[PDB]
Amino acid sequence: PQLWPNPNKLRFADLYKYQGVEMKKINDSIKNYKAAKFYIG
Amino acid sequence: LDDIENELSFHAAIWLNAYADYTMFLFELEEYNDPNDYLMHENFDFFRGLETELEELTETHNYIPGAKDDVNLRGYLATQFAWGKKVISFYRHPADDFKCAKATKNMLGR
Amino acid sequence: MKKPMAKAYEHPYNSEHHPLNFSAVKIAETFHDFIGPEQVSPHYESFAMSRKFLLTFWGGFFVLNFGMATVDLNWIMKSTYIPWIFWFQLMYFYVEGKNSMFMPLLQRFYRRAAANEIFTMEAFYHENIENKLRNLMRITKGQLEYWDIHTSYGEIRADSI
Amino acid sequence: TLQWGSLAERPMVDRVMSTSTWPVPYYQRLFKAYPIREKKDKMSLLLSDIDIDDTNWYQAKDFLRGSFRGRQIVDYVENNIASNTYILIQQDVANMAKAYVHDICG
Amino acid sequence: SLHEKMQTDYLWVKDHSQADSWAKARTHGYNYIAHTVPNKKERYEMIWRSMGKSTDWELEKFRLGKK
Amino acid sequence: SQFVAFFAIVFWLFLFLYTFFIIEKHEDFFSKKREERKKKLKELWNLKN
Amino acid sequence: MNPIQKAWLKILEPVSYVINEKMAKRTGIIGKLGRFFAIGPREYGVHPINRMFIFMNRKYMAFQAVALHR
Amino acid sequence: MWYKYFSKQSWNLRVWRKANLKYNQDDFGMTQPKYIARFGDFRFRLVRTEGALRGCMFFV
Amino acid sequence: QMGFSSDNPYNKRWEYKWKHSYYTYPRDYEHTEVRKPQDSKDVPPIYFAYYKDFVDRWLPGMNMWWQRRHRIFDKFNVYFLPGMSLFFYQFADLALGFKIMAAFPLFLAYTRIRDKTLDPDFKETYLRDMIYQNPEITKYFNEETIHVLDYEFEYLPGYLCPEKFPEYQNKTWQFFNTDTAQAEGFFKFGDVESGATMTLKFKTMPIPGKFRYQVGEPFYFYDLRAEIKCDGVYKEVVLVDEKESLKKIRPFLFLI
Amino acid sequence: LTQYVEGQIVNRNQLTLKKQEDIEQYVLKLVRGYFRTTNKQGLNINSVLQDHGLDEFDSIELAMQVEEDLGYVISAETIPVLNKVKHFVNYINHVEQFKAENGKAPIA
Amino acid sequence: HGWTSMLSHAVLLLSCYSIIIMFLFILGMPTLLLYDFGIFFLAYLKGAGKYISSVAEMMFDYTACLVFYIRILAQWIRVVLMVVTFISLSHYVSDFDIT
Amino acid sequence: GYKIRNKSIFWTRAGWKNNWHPKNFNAPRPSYGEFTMGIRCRNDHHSFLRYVQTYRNMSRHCKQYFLGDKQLEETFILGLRSLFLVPYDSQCLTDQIKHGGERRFVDQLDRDFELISYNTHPYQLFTYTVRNEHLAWKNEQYEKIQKGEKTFEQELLDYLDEQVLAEKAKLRDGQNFSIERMTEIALHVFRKARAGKVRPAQDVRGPDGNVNDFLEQRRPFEHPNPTGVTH
């Protein structure tokens, strides 16, 4: 709760391994890219 | 005596469950105010399940508004001054066609 | 407590960012991500009224910019005369003339009046739904009166003896 | 009124404050911001004015079976009660009064 | 009963003797509407309320009548 | 006038003259199910829903 | 935050240390200059062109689902 | 019990090969005149109706 | 025998009659029991909808023609119509009128094949109305308690006995027809209330009715027999006897 | 032949009754196990399912469970006539007798 | 059609194609309707015959099918009237006096 | 609240609240056998058995992906019946529908089962999501009970039991502890607990008229430049 990431009070290592809602969308798109290997191939 | 002791106990649990439904709804309704002040996709999140039923209307191509609503109150408000005032028939699909055709001894199938 | 199931079925082709089925709700979410949040101004005055002199300069700069660039502006003014006369005389009645001549054509007003009434019904949603529950709660409270009578029978049977 | 001012000062007349603070921020909020599509812990508001139905007794058994006394109630009702429905509705005291006259004779 | 008593009473709902001669607004306000005013929605309510009084809130009479 | 007369004849009148709907039915089980279903919910209606 | 932003961080890791730890708090003008070019999470870093595609792709796909389902 | 819910008011026609068998072809149509000769009788004997005969003579 | 039959296990006698509103066919055939998620194939392969329409609509439709191919092998369909189509095909380039007269006998040949290869469908609502009037049948059977254990109905091959039916010994009729248009079958019934079963054997023939050229009833039950079997009682009910029914009416002898 | 039971794959077994008393005891256990059945002990051979809180759709679920346990393939034409406990018992007898004489399952 | 002014070198390209589309598919509506009637399609139009001569009825059946299509194709004269009337107004406005 | 004032709101050309047989020009008319040569009609008497088979298909094909969850199967049955009981209980006279209400609903349900057979129906995807969120919470409680810890639900139940004892020990004049009083005791605890959690703002306006969003930051300006990450 009080350990939630703050864009101001943030470490460099924490920002590099943030993995927020933006990355969760991309990881879903990557699952589609991988599953389309045989169709595109 | 144990027959009605357990009968009335289960009867009370049924209506206590209904009482908790109406009580909990009025409790969650305290945080919801002015539906006109919420975005479209957030209003659907308060009323979870409406997005699912909206996808059912889309995937089955029931894109006639209010066709599956028993009282299409929105359809009546839209046609208060319409010519040939009518609402869509219940569960009318835009693709179904019940047209018939007959040949009689007279012309035009009469 | 009995151990529940570990998980339900997980659909391999449905996600939150790429939902399998379609509706206006998901499109509405991606639309507001695009236009972004409501650009709320924190100031005491609106941006246009505070910079009227400055916006007037840049307003006339681009007018002059287009005017200095367009050397054949008179050819464009003359080429626009015929369609300007034609389309305005043709659509006058359907836009404005109907408001004081042969027919009103109130179709678009009927759509405003119905939507204005729905705006009020949504504003009074909490009131209307609460009145509907007052009748259901009355029915529920009436059924719960039979259990209150039964819980006193043991005391009645004991005091009667 | 229909004369509110110039076009540039049109967005000025919208704000209405609940406090006495000056100067006043002019912007009138249109909607509530919804940045993250978070699944709400709140229950759905569709469950509003639904009449009594099968889901009431089905959920009553599920919550009663969480207790020792409730497990006895459910088992006796589903086995030893001559009713053609689980949606029990008390509209008379026939079954109640006749159960007391058959019990208080002792 | 008192509500219907005054609706039927001729003295309560009766034009003045000179009402026929007076200038009459022959519109409910739907011909020229204020679109960009902040009280735009309140204007529409008064138009709807004016149309309802003319037909005793039976708007089917308005739908069949002449506009 | 010619706009209305076009669609009122090419589609509305043309199909009224050569197509129709039957009034005889082949199955009527919805009517008898609704009657039995209403008797099943007699107690709930008695509570004024 | 995306992988391209995280790749910039590993390359600019020593530059971020000089700006955020040394320059951003020294004094005076060097402090203001270091706090202005600070390195971290992008404020207003959303890409509208990416979002324009996601919206238009979804809206055009719902149309494809209707036109192709005949 | 599907026959319990079958409506006998559909017995007004006896449809077979897109034709109502309860059609008074002896009183109406090309098959009404009884003074038809051997060729006309053998022609109606094949088709068994005038609608099918007229439809084929359309293309012939 | 039902001509139109897919790999679907349920409702065999209704498969050709039921007109589903499906856009395409279901992923799997109707399950006979609850299966596992891995029992079926998620995301069916590409061109699956085209494959299903071939194996569920095209293929059983061709097996219907092949099963009843003996009803279309007459001299009219085999020799006259193709011979007529070949005579005008030699002049198909001269004018358009030869193209029409060369294709019409082909379309006429298709329609006779389409009509003759369909399953023999009698008016079953007439039959149930007929048996529910008999007091000896309604004693053990009622519509609300009857169920079908087996059903069979197929045309009879070739010409019948030329003493019981001298009608079919007509050279003009034999030129157009290679079969009789008569059908025979049975109905295995059971009653869940009384526990009784019966076999309803019947023979049908087309009869003329009320008019000169049109057939009256293409499937007229001229012999309708029921062998009712109960807990310990065996009864035989004769609704329509052929020795008495064939003395009043004769078959129709379809042409074309 | 295997099904999931509370998240675990379990091998399913089929029953062969072939006896009147085994049929009545199976059907009673079948109807009592259905979660919509009321008055489970008042259920006898002559019990109408409507008197125990069951409708036409509950008879389909009951027949669907018969195909699971006995391996039958019951057509949709037979289901709407199964409205009593006696009807299930007589139908099971009719299926076993039909297979004992005709050598095949009834038409589906 | 204003939003398609820059999509091609002809402002009325979509309108010129749509009038042909509207003509072809409307012309096909009666043709598919007769196909739905079947071989009895002539009885659906004219009804029962009157004479025993198939050649005589053929001429009445040919006119019955001719009238079937004339009821549709003749309505396009109404479209010509709207275009002629629309052009006459455009010719008067475009040549109106301005000096 | 607010009620519709137009008394003719539910009037149609076919009658009051008529959404089963709307009035149109091409009205259904009878056919006479003696005068009818041929006919093209798609109506039949097969909707009853198709309605039965569709229920069996939808039930059995959805249970394929329930993993034997008995409670989910019984819950799904209650939901499936509510979909098939629409024509039997609706205000609309489904027996008076224009061209056969039975055929219309059967064809409508077949479109649903086609999606169900492919495991793509939105009611299915909604069921898997709801059940996964439910089992995740039940597994959290099970892990806390195996560890001897008290669940958050038991803490409120125990806290609410001692509140009733405290209220009924001070209320000696009256001895009728109504369900109304029992409810407002729990709701007073529920509001305090809900306000204690760090939840996203649900209501539009906070205690003031202002919105509770991150965008509702107006003057005065008192925030400096954003600071970077720390090493």
Ligand SMILES: CCCCCCCCCCCCCCCCCC(=O)OC[C@H](COP(=O)([O-])OCC(O)COP(=O)([O-])OC[C@@H](COC(=O)CCCCCCCCCCCCCCCCC)OC(=O)CCCCCCCCCCCCCCCCC)OC(=O)CCCCCCCCCCCCCCCCC
């Ligand atoms: C001032 C103006 C300046 C103008 C110039 C710049 C304009 C801006 C352009 C920006 C838009 C285009 C973006 C291009 C890349 C930019 C980097 C980027 O993506 O943004 C950072 C982006 C972060 O996204 P975000 O915008 O910040 O937020 C995401 C949201 O939260 C939600 O997450 P999300 O994943 O849902 O969001 C996806 C996101 C980004 O998704 C992407 O990953 C971008 C993918 C773009 C295409 C890449 C594949 C190109 C295939 C090349 C094939 C090889 C060619 C050579 C062959 C060798 C032989 C010589 O948005 C897009 O998809 C944008 C795509 C725009 C449409 C592109 C297609 C147009 C089709 C119409 C035809 C037009 C004709 C010209 C097209 C030219 C194409 C070359 O980073 C990532 O996504 C990381 C991806 C991690 C996995 C990558 C694995 C590789 C996947 C490659 C695709 C494989 C598909 C199968 C192969 C197909 C070909 C055979």
Ligand SMILES: CCCCCCCCCCCCCCCCCC(=O)OC[C@H](COP(=O)([O-])OCC(O)COP(=O)([O-])OC[C@@H](COC(=O)CCCCCCCCCCCCCCCCC)OC(=O)CCCCCCCCCCCCCCCCC)OC(=O)CCCCCCCCCCCCCCCCC
């Ligand atoms: C190398 C040197 C060259 C490079 C130099 C670089 C510097 C360039 C300078 C550019 C300056 C950029 C910074 C400011 C950008 C926005 C300017 C502005 O007025 O925003 C305040 C204004 C209100 O701000 P606010 O005070 O905070 O009030 C907030 C409430 O929402 C207010 O809503 P409300 O309804 O409650 O209150 C009234 C509202 C009433 O205003 C409105 O709500 C809407 C007004 C109409 C919007 C425009 C309709 C255009 C329809 C599209 C057709 C033309 C598109 C142009 C491109 C087409 C292809 C060429 O606005 C007002 O407060 C008074 C009106 C102030 C004038 C705004 C309208 C002027 C026309 C701007 C459109 C410019 C493009 C078309 C011009 C002719 C073609 C060149 O916002 C807008 O009007 C948005 C309109 C779209 C903005 C982008 C338009 C392009 C850039 C505009 C530059 C304007 C001057 C140059 C053109 C003038 C020609 C006559």
Ligand SMILES: CCCCCCCCCCCCCCCCCC(=O)OC[C@H](COP(=O)([O-])OCC(O)COP(=O)([O-])OC[C@@H](COC(=O)CCCCCCCCCCCCCCCCC)OC(=O)CCCCCCCCCCCCCCCCC)OC(=O)CCCCCCCCCCCCCCCCC
């Ligand atoms: C010329 C150049 C030619 C070049 C080549 C052209 C191409 C030819 C090859 C292709 C031929 C066409 C193929 C058509 C077949 C396609 C299938 C079909 O459509 O069905 C057949 C089709 C069916 O006709 P239908 O209308 O359905 O029959 C009416 C009823 O259905 C039938 O009803 P019903 O059966 O119950 O009874 C019918 C009849 C009862 O009929 C009978 O019972 C008689 C039966 C007799 C049978 C005899 C058997 C003999 C057997 C052989 C001999 C025995 C063995 C000998 C062995 C010897 C061995 C060596 O009852 C009546 O009372 C008839 C009404 C009174 C007669 C009306 C006649 C109108 C004629 C008007 C003109 C008169 C002018 C006279 C001048 C004469 C001198 C030039 O037959 C026709 O198409 C006939 C042609 C109709 C043309 C109409 C327009 C032309 C009018 C005549 C021309 C006027 C002259 C103009 C110029 C004047 C100066 C010369």
Ligand SMILES: CCCCCCCCCCCCCCCCCC(=O)OC[C@H](COP(=O)([O-])OCC(O)COP(=O)([O-])OC[C@@H](COC(=O)CCCCCCCCCCCCCCCCC)OC(=O)CCCCCCCCCCCCCCCCC)OC(=O)CCCCCCCCCCCCCCCCC
């Ligand atoms: C420049 C272009 C100009 C043209 C523009 C349009 C282009 C054309 C496209 C139009 C559509 C054509 C495609 C049709 C597809 C048909 C498919 C099919 O065959 O299904 C069968 C189907 C019939 O089945 P059904 O009606 O559903 O039910 C039949 C019953 O079940 C049956 O009940 P039943 O068993 O009681 O009936 C008995 C039998 C009775 O039949 C008879 O009448 C018998 C006739 C006599 C036979 C000969 C007897 C010989 C006697 C010899 C005796 C020997 C024995 C001697 C003694 C023995 C010796 C020992 O009836 C039949 O079975 C025959 C029905 C089928 C006849 C074939 C009809 C189609 C022929 C088309 C020919 C030309 C096609 C060219 C297309 C090329 C491709 C582009 O055929 C049709 O439905 C025909 C529909 C036609 C409607 C479309 C008409 C559109 C109007 C066009 C003219 C427009 C003019 C104005 C234009 C204005 C500008 C646009």
Ligand SMILES: CCCCCCCCCCCCCCCCCC(=O)OC[C@H](COP(=O)([O-])OCC[N+](C)(C)C)OC(=O)CCCCCCCCCCCCCCCCC
């Ligand atoms: C805006 C850009 C996109 C444009 C898309 C088109 C938008 C059209 C908006 C909907 C208007 C549709 C009008 C339909 C008729 C409504 C009036 C009515 O029902 O009549 C009732 C009328 C009026 O009765 P009434 O009671 O409702 O009104 C009474 C009128 N007052 C109040 C004045 C007394 O009654 C009739 O029955 C007459 C029927 C005449 C039929 C006329 C319409 C025929 C054409 C319709 C079919 C066209 C299909 C074309 C398809 C082409 C495909 C290739």
Ligand SMILES: CCCCCCCCCCCCCCCCCC(=O)OC[C@H](COP(=O)([O-])OCC[N+](C)(C)C)OC(=O)CCCCCCCCCCCCCCCCC
């Ligand atoms: C001269 C060389 C050949 C010339 C070209 C011939 C091409 C023939 C194949 C393409 C056309 C096929 C017909 C398409 C239109 C009808 C669609 C359809 O099939 O519906 C079936 C329909 C299906 O019935 P239905 O469509 O009415 O609906 C069924 C009812 N419900 C929905 C309730 C289930 O059935 C039929 O019409 C009967 C069978 C039609 C047979 C079609 C032709 C088959 C030809 C087989 C040739 C075999 C020998 C050669 C090959 C040898 C092996 C390689």
Ligand SMILES: COC1=C(OC)C(=O)C(C/C=C(\C)CC/C=C(\C)CC/C=C(\C)CC/C=C(\C)CC/C=C(\C)CC/C=C(/C)CC/C=C(\C)CCC=C(C)C)=C(C)C1=O
């Ligand atoms: C298949 O079904 C369909 C859809 O899906 C349902 C659709 O959405 C749609 C709608 C289509 C859209 C919504 C897309 C619209 C896009 C349009 C119109 C054009 C987009 C143009 C841009 C985004 C501009 C980008 C600018 C440029 C490309 C010019 C500069 C060059 C650049 C940036 C690339 C340099 C060139 C290279 C060859 C290097 C490539 C670089 C990379 C791959 C780097 C990526 C790095 C990582 C780490 C991923 C259709 C029509 C459809 O048919």
Ligand SMILES: Nc1ncnc2c1ncn2[C@@H]1O[C@H](COP(=O)(O)OP(=O)(O)OP(=O)(O)O)[C@@H](O)[C@H]1O
């Ligand atoms: N009285 C009728 N009115 C209008 N159309 C009809 C009528 N009877 C049949 N039709 C149409 O003709 C088709 C064939 O009718 P048919 O009697 O052969 O069906 P059926 O299911 O075999 O009846 P049955 O169960 O008695 O055998 C029907 O599917 C229907 O579309």
Ligand SMILES: [Mg+2]
């Ligand atoms: Mg039949």
